[PDB]
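User: I'm writing a short methods note and want a consistent example. For Threonine--tRNA ligase, I'll paste the sequence; you return only the structure tokens, no commentary, since I'll be parsing the reply automatically.
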Amino acid sequence: MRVLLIHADYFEYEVKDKALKNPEPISEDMKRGRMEEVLVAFISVEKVDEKNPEEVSLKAIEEISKVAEQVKAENVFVVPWAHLSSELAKPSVAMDILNRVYQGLKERGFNVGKAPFGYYIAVKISCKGHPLAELSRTIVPE
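Assistant:
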């Protein structure tokens, strides 16, 4: 797994076309979402994570939680994202891990949003630019 974490004043998205023939189904209401004062977690789930969905999920929850605690963000947003890796996992595995990370951050006590899997999405973001506002993490099976 590769993750990029961006502490943002706001994050807004609007789903455009479908990228997979069969993407994640959504209410007209989940086509557009927005949060303020939000740690956005762009997650590329990789091939090597199929080995172990739960270790990798727990690791990611932890690593995202610490940074969230450290930057004083109560709001977290999980985003499926192809662009930190080139050896990516098949969608069931990615869907799986992303849902586990989402659920685990709700259980830690954050107000969590996520993005629908398998669309092209239009995005607006304002990135804070203090020292800890943009971080990369690599997470692997030990």
